Amino acid sequence: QAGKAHSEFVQPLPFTLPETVPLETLQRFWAHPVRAFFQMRLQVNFRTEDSEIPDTEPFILEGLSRYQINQQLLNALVEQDDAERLFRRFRAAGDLPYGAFGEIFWETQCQEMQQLADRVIACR
Amino acid sequence: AETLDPLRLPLQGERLIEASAGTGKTFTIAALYLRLLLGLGGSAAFPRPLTVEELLVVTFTEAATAELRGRIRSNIHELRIACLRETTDNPLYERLLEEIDDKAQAAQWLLLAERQMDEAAVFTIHGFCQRMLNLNAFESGMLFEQQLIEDESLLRYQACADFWRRHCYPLPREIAQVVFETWKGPQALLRDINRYLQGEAPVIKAPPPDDETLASRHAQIVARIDTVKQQWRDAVGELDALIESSGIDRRKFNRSNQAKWIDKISAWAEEETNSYQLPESLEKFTPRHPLFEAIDQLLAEPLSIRDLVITRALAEIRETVAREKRRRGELGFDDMLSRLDSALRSESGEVLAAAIRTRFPVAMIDEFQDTDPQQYRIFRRIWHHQPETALLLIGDPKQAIYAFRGADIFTYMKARSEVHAHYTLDTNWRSAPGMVNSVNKLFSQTDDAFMFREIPFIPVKSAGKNQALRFVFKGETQPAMKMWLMEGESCGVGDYQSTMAQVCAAQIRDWLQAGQRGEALLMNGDDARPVRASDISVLVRSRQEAAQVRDALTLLEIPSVYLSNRDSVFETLEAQEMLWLLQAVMTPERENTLRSALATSMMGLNALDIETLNNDEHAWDVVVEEFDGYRQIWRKRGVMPMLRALMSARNIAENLLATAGGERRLTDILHISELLQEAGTQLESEHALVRWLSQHILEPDSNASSQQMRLESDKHLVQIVTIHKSKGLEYPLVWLPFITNFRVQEQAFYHDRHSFEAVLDLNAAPESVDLAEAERLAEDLRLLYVALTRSVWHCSLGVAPLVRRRGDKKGDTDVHQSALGRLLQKGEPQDAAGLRTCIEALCDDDIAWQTAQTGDNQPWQVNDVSTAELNAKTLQRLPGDNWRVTSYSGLQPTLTPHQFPRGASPGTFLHSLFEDLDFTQPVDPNWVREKLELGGFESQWEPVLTEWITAVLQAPLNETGVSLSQLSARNKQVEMEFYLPISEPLIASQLDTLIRQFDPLSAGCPPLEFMQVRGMLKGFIDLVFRHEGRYYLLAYKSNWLGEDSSAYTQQAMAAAMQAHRYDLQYQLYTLALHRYLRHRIADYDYEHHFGGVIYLFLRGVDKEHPQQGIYTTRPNAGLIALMDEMFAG
DNA sequence: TTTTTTTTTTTTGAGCGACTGCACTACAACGTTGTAGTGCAGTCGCTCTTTTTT
C-alpha cells in the first residue's frame, strides 16, 4: 500500500488564440465541448468497433435507418416530388419490410412528413 | 396435522412433511437417512435395511445436494464413531444408539456406508431423469449420447421468425393492417408467448376450429360490421327517445359522425359514438328498436384476430423447436422430464417403472413446493400405492415463490388432496422469539390468510436457546418489528420510494454511528456484539428500487453491495479499455489506437502527461518499443504473461489499489484477463481473440462464468438482496422499504379451482382476470412471508398509503390491493387514518410503529488503522540444471525416381515401405498397388516403383558384395531404439575437437553450438544385420531433392554428409552399437565384430552403378573408446 | 498484369389516465340571466420485477 493515487485528468494547459478561427471550429466546439477538447486538443478519439451483421431481415424500422428514411422523405416532400418513386427505390434495396408492412410503414412516415412539410413550405 | 418426530415416522406409503421456515429440514433429512440405513423404528420401520445405493434423495438446487451429501457423510462418520464408542454428545444420536440392540453389525454397516458414500444416490431432478433415461434406454427410447444446450432462446426466436414468415407474408392489405395493429413484428409475438412456449403447454379455453384461417375470421367480422351498418342505414332519420338532463342535445351530431362512418369495410375500429347508442347506457342516462341492441351485441365481445394467431403460434413454434432439436440431436433441461413422462405414459414403460421399483424402493423428495406437474405425474406413476416403497414429500407451501420459473401451488394442493398423512415441524431455530411472535401475530389476524382453503397457517414455536436475543439501542431494548408508517394522505411511487429510502438510510447511519461507540448492540444472554455494516441488510424486490436504495445509501458515505447483481463483466468500461489495449498491442504502428489506449483510466495519466507524450518523440518511441515487446510476449507466451508484464512494468495494479474505489475495477480487470486466457487457448489466431472480445462486449448475454463477482470480502458492506435470492439465508437486521408496493396482473392465465389445470383465456373475460389476480395476491402474500421470516433480531417495515390508481385524492387507498394491507386492514378497503388505526390496533411488545423523519446530520466516521510491515522471500539460486532427454535432431522417361515428389511424407512412406517389406521374397506388384492405395499416391507410379525396389534389392551394399536377399529374419533387426546415458555436461568445444581429431570429414564444417546436455539421448537405428560373423548398420536417407542425374558420386555424398552433419549421428550410432554388442555378447571385440556403417540413398541407387547410392564408412576404433569415456564419466 | 487512397456524425417512448381551461346548452330564478352538467382540447404523471437447472 505504498503507491501514488490517480491524479486528476484536468490540468491547466497553455493555449494562444489564433487570428483566423473558422466557423466550423466553433460549431464543432459548441456541438460537444468535451469531445472537442479530447479529439482536437490532445487528439484522443475513442474509436469503437463497427456493428456486426444482423441475422435476419429488418421487420421494423428504428434507429439510424428510420432517421435516414425520414430525412430523405422530408427532403423529397420539400420539393413536392413523387413519394412512390422513393418508395420503390427504398423497396428495391431491401431496406423496407416485405409486402404490405413496408407499405404501411411508408404510408405512416409519408403522413408524418407531409404534416411536417405543410408547415415547412408554408413560409419558404 | 401432527408433529413430526424423525425416530417415529412410519416409512410406509406416502407421507407429506411440511417444514416451516428456519426449521431443521436438512437435519431431519439426515436423521431419516440414518433411519433408512440402519433400519430403525420397530413397528414403523422398513421391512429390510437398505444400502447407500438404494436411498434416493431428490433436491432441486445442486449446492443443496452437495451440502446434504457432505452433511450425511459427516453424520455417517459421527454415528460410526459413536457406535464404536457406545457414547455421543448429541441427544438424537443418543436415542439412535439407544434404539439399536447390536453394535458390531451396525458399525460394520456404517463402515460400508462410509466406503460406499461416493456411490450415493443423491441426485437432482434432471440428473435423476437423465440417469433413468440412459439406464433403461430400451423401454424409454433414448439415445445413449446426447448434447445438452444451455440457451434455448435462439432456436425459439428462429422458429417464431419462421412462423411469421410462413403466416404473415402472404396476407393481403386488409388483414395485414389488423396484424400490424396487433403486433409490429415477430418480436412482440415472441414477447407475448414466451411465458407459454417454455414448460408445460397450457390448455386454451374455447379454441378456434382447425379449418378457420385468418381470411375467414376477417370476412366474418367484416360481415358482422356490415350487418350493423345496414341496420343503421335502414333505421336512420328518426328520433323518438326522451331528452334527459344527462343526455345533451348534441347526439344528432354523433349521428352525423355515424353518417360518415359507413363508407367502406376496409377499417377494423368502430366509432365511440356507438357507445352512445346502447340501450343499457341510454336507459341509465325507451330504446325500442333492435338496432341499438345490435350495436350493443357488436360491442359485447371485442373484434380481434389475436386469439387465432396466438393459437397458431402455440401450435407451430413448439413443434418446430422440437423438430429442430430432434434433427440436431440436442436435448434440454425440461426435455428430460418430457421424455420420462412420455416413457411412463406408454404401456411398456409401466414395467420400466417396476424397474425403478427394482432400482430404488424409496424416495425422499426435498423442496416439493418447486414441483412441476410432470414431476408429480412421474412420482405418482412410480410410487402411488405399491407396497414396500415409501414416498416422503418434504416441502413448504408458504415458500412457493418460484411461480415465474415454472412452479405451481395448485400441484401442491393436488398432492395434499391425494395423500392422507400430514406432518409439521414445530420448532424454529433461527430468529428471536419476538420476531417469531410478530410473524405469528401478523399472519393469524384473519382466517385463511393465504386466501386458499388447502394452505393453512400454524403458529410456530421459537427456540429455547435463542430466547435471550436482543437488539439493544442506546435508549432501551428495541422491539422486533418496527412498521415505519410514512405520513401523508396520498403519495406517488417515486416519491414514496425516495422518502422510504432516505428514512432507511437515516436509520442505517444512526445504527452505524451508535454502533461504533458501543451503544447499539446485539446481545445473546450477556454476550454483546457491536453492529457493523454487514449486519444491516435491505430486502428489495426489483432492480430499480435496489438502485434507489443504493443511491440513497451512498449519499451518506455508506458503502453497500448488491448480492443479486447478475450483470455481465463484459458490459462495463473495463472491457472496452482492455479491448483498446489489445488493439494497441496488436497494431502498435498506428499512433491513433495507441494514443486512445494510453489515455484510458487503466493507465491513469494526466492531460499534461499525454501532451508531453505527444510532444516528445523519444518517449513515444520508447512506448512503441515496449508495446512491440508486449506483442512479442503475446505471440510467444500468451495472454496472461503479456498482461502480467504490462501490469508489472506500468505498475497500474498498485495505482489502482492505492486509489479509493479501484479495487472493484482491478478485480474486473483480473476476471477479464482470466476469461481472455480461457478463450485464447481455444483459438489459434491472434485477431480471433480480439474479435471474440468485441463480440462478447456486443453480446450482453449472461453465463455462469461471465458474471460479476464480489469485489471485497474483508470490508463489511450493507448487503442488498432480493426476496427470491434471500430464501434460506440469514440476516441479523432486515429493512423492507418497499414491502407495500404491489403490481396488478393484466393477462388472463389462471388455474381451475376443481381440475387444477392451467387455463389460458385469450378473451378478456373478467372472471379469468379476477382468478389470475387472486393467484397474484397469493404469490404476493407468499413473498411477504418469505421476506418477513428472514430477520433474526430486528425487522423494519415501510408502510404508506400507496395508491396505484391515477387519481391523487379519491378518498380510498389501494393498500388493500397489496399483501401487507390485506393483513393490516383485514382485507378491507380503508383510508390513511384507517390504515393508521389498523397499525395502532396490533401494538405489542414486539410490534411498534414510528413516523418517517426526513433528516441528515453527518454521513459517517472512517476510523482507519495503520498496516504492519511485510516482506517477500527471494530465491537464492537457479531452480534447475539443463536436464532434458533429447535426440540427434535436438543437437542439430516420364516415370523415374528422380521425378518422385521430394518431401517428408514421401520419405516416411518410402521408409515404411522398406521397413514392412520382406527382403527374401520377390516384390509383388499388387502389394505395391495396395500399399499405394493405403498411402494415397498415384497408381501409374506403381509398375516403375516395384522394379525400382527390386533394383534397390538387386544392388549389393558391402565391401565383399553382399546383397539384402542373403539376410535371414533372425539376422536382421529393423528400427532398433536405444537410450544412451550421459552424466557429464556435454561441452561442444570438448566434443567437436575430439571428433575433428580422428574424423577426416571434419576438415571444414564449422562447429555447431548447443547447450550443456546432461541426461539421456534417444536414437532409432534403421537396420542392424549380421553376416559371416560381422555386424553392420544401415540407415535410410531419401530426400535427395537436388540430384536427378548420375552425379551422386562419393564426393557429392561426402558433401551431403558434411552439410547435413550426419557424421555425429553415425558416430553416436557406432557408440550405441559398440555398447550394445559389449552388453549383449560376452568376450566382445570392437575390431573383430563390427564391420562398418552403410548409408543407403534410395534415389541414388542405379543398376549399372553399384557404388552410387551406398556409402560405407568405418571408424578409427580409437574415437569410440574416448567417446565412451566422455559419456560415462 | 501494372497499380491509388480515405477520415465526418446523425437517432431513439407512446399509450393510459388524470387536471384544468373553454365552450355550449338545459333549466330555474328574476324575455332575460345565473347555476349546473357535459364534451372537446391542451398539458402533465408514469411506466415496463424476481432465476437456475449437465
UniProtKB/Swiss-Prot annotation, chain A:
Mutant lacking the gene: phenotype: Decreased degradation of DNA with free ends that is unable to undergo homologous recombination, which can fortuitously lead to more efficient viral infection. Cells are deficient in DNA recombination repair and have increased sensitivity to UV light. The cultures have many inviable cells. Cells can be transformed with retron Ec48-containing plasmids.
Miscellaneous: In the RecBCD complex, RecB has a slow 3'-5' helicase, an exonuclease activity and loads RecA onto ssDNA, RecD has a fast 5'-3' helicase activity while RecC stimulates the ATPase and processivity of the RecB helicase and contributes to recognition of the Chi site.
Assembly mode: Heterotrimer of RecB, RecC and RecD. All subunits contribute to DNA-binding. Interacts with YgbT (Cas1).
UniProt record similarity statement: Belongs to the RecC family.
Protein function: A helicase/nuclease that prepares dsDNA breaks (DSB) for recombinational DNA repair. Binds to DSBs and unwinds DNA via a rapid (>1 kb/second) and highly processive (>30 kb) ATP-dependent bidirectional helicase. Unwinds dsDNA until it encounters a Chi (crossover hotspot instigator, 5'-GCTGGTGG-3') sequence from the 3' direction. Cuts ssDNA a few nucleotides 3' to Chi site, by nicking one strand or switching the strand degraded (depending on the reaction conditions). The properties and activities of the enzyme are changed at Chi.
Written domain comment of the UniProt record: The holoenzyme may undergo conformational shifts upon DNA binding: the nuclease domain of RecB may swing away from the DNA exit tunnel in RecC. When Chi DNA binds to the RecC tunnel, the nuclease domain may then swing back to its original position (that seen in crystal structures), allowing it to nick the DNA 3' of the Chi site and then rotate to load RecA. At high Mg(2+) the nuclease domain may swing back more frequently, explaining differences seen in assays performed at high Mg(2+).
Name of the protein: RecBCD enzyme subunit RecC
Biological source species: Escherichia coli (strain K12)
Whole-protein residues included: 812 to 935 of 1122
Swiss-Prot record, chain B:
Catalyzed reaction equations: Exonucleolytic cleavage (in the presence of ATP) in either 5'- to 3'- or 3'- to 5'-direction to yield 5'-phosphooligonucleotides; Couples ATP hydrolysis with the unwinding of duplex DNA by translocating in the 3'-5' direction; ATP + H2O = ADP + phosphate + H(+)
Top-level taxon of origin: Bacteria
Record's keyword annotation contains Isomerase: yes
GO molecular function, one term: DNA binding
Cofactor: Mg(2+)
Enzyme active site: 1035 (for nuclease activity)
InterPro entries attached to this UniProt entry: DNA_helicase_UvrD-like_C, DNA_helicase_UvrD/REP, P-loop_NTPase, PDDEXK-like_dom_sf, PDDEXK_AddAB-type, RecB, Restrct_endonuc-II-like, UvrD-like_ATP-bd
Residues that hold ATP according to the record: 19-26, 429
Impact when changing residue 789 to I: In recB-2109; absence of nuclease modification at Chi sites
Record-linked Pfam families: PDDEXK_1, UvrD-helicase, UvrD_C
Region Nuclease activity, interacts with RecD and RecA: start-end pairs: 882-1129
Observed effect of gene inactivation: Decreased degradation of DNA with free ends that is unable to undergo homologous recombination, which can fortuitously lead to more efficient viral infection. Cells are deficient in DNA recombination repair and have increased sensitivity to UV light. The cultures have many inviable cells. Cells cannot be transformed with retron Ec48-containing plasmids.
Keywords of the record: ATP-binding, DNA damage, DNA repair, DNA-binding, Exonuclease, Helicase, Hydrolase, Isomerase, Magnesium, Metal-binding, Nuclease, Nucleotide-binding
DNA-binding region: 248-250, 493-494, 542-543, 743
HAMAP family tied to this protein: RecB
Oligomeric form and interacting partners: Heterotrimer of RecB, RecC and RecD. All subunits contribute to DNA-binding. The C-terminus interacts with RecA. Interacts with YgbT (Cas1).
Protein name: RecBCD enzyme subunit RecB
Species: Escherichia coli (strain K12)
Gene this chain is encoded by: recB
